Design a protein around this nucleic acid. Structure first.
Ligand code: CL
Ligand code: CL
Ligand code: CL
Ligand code: CL
Ligand code: CL
Ligand code: CL
Ligand code: MN
Ligand code: MN
Ligand code: MN
Ligand code: MN
Ligand code: MN
Ligand code: MN
Ligand code: NA
Ligand code: NA
Ligand code: NA
Ligand code: NA
Ligand code: NA
Ligand code: NA
Ligand code: NA
Ligand code: NA
Ligand code: NA
Length: 333
DNA sequence: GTCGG
DNA sequence: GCTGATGCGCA
DNA sequence: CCGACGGCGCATCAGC
């Protein structure tokens, strides 16, 4: 059904192998870039030559594409798939808090499976233990209807703490997706601007409230502006429990809301491409500001921004609505 | 790994 | 304490 | 051993 589905799944697999096993992050990013441009390509790829025309596809992927098209597989990937060490390493990184270095360490110590990992809980830090505890639940996606209930709860409780907070659910949700990986909330409040923090514990108060009402159930990491943890909807009387979910909360200066909401709306790929296009135009964008780079590549003063579109205009891109910042694929008959 | 020098 | 490096996470 | 590739928050360590 997915047009060029075979190719893009191959490149995604290779990407995960480079990131997770090889610890080669640039090759990860190359394979990701290549799989992104191919999936958005509206034609059937017939040869490596044709793929090579696209930006991000060079000689080695085209070569891989030629092989895949001829044989229906890739020998490199078949060998990786056979390697139990490479497989277990790859698998352990799916646990939140376990990245490529801790996975490799664990596998070399004989920790190869989910069952093994539970038995070695005392090797795990808190982040990892919570990721393990909820590993099955965090695999599941969240239907938009549950996203709306999660929204209702978050916005009710923020308003209880202080009616001047504004919470905005970003991520896939803001891009209109029918299901989401997790819930990403952007928080602002007038006391926190880029120039001053006139109130203390602005993020901590909201988090405390969300735990007090037993929405937030666990914490992975927590600072002054970013919270990362776990939440769960209330189940009704006698109906089964809802799964636990990942929730991110990011407090952003009130005067930089637009760079903020652009960042937290994503997608990640869109952001990396948008920020890459800024660089070639002579700007640098982060979640706070868009700045010009001087002759030496040092950023200068923030430019004024009164809307998301102002950011796109500075870098000569047509505005793209949030729905159009998601990745997309094409189909065949 | 791909691109821009 | 500061800084800066590594590891992990976010979009 | 051509070097850039988006950019940053939190956690933890090392060297000063
Ligand atoms: Cl690399
Ligand atoms: Cl294969
Ligand atoms: Cl894009
Ligand atoms: Cl900044
Ligand atoms: Cl997407
Ligand atoms: Cl890179
Ligand atoms: Mn489809
Ligand atoms: Mn397309
Ligand atoms: Mn998300
Ligand atoms: Mn998230
Ligand atoms: Mn303008
Ligand atoms: Mn994500
Ligand atoms: Na197909
Ligand atoms: Na190319
Ligand atoms: Na992980
Ligand atoms: Na509501
Ligand atoms: Na903490
Ligand atoms: Na659960
Ligand atoms: Na561009
Ligand atoms: Na204005
Ligand atoms: Na990066």
């Amino acid at each position: 059904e997915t047009l060029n589905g075979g190719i893009t799944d191959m490149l995604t697999e290779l990407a995960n192998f480079e990131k997770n096993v090889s610890q080669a992050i640039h090759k990860y990013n190359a394979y990701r870039k290549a799989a992104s441009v191919i999936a958005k390509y509206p034609h059937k790829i017939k040869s490596g030559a044709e793929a090579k025309k696209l930006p991000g596809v060079g000689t080695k992927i085209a070569e891989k594409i030629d092989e895949f098209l001829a044989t229906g597989k890739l020998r490199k990937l078949e060998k990786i798939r056979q390697d139990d060490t490479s497989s277990s390493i790859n698998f352990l990184t799916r646990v939140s808090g376990i990245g490529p270095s801790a996975a490799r360490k664990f596998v070399d110590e004989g920790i190869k499976t989910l069952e093994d990992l539970r038995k070695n809980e005392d090797k795990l830090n808190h982040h990892q233990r919570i990721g393990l505890k909820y590993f099955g639940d965090f695999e599941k996606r969240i239907p938009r209807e549950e996203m709306l209930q999660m929204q209702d709860i978050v916005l009710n409780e923020v308003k209880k703490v202080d009616s001047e907070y504004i919470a905005t659910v970003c991520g896939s949700f803001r891009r209109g997706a029918e299901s989401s990986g997790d819930m990403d909330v952007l928080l602002t409040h007038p006391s926190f601007t880029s120039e001053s923090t006139k109130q203390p514990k602005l993020l901590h108060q909201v988090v405390e409230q969300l735990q007090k009402v037993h929405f937030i159930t666990d914490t992975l990491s927590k600072g002054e502006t970013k919270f990362m943890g776990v939440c769960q909807l209330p189940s009704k009387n006698d109906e089964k429990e809802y799964p636990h979910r990942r929730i991110d909360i990011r407090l952003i200066p009130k005067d930089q809301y637009y760079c903020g909401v652009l960042y937290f709306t994503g997608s990640d790929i869109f952001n990396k491409n948008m920020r890459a296009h800024a660089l070639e135009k002579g700007f640098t964008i982060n979640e706070y500001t868009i700045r010009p780079l001087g002759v030496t590549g040092v950023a200068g003063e923030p430019l004024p921004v009164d809307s998301e579109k102002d950011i796109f205009d500075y870098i000569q891109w047509k505005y793209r609505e949030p729905k159009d910042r998601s990745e997309h694929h094409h189909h065949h008959h």
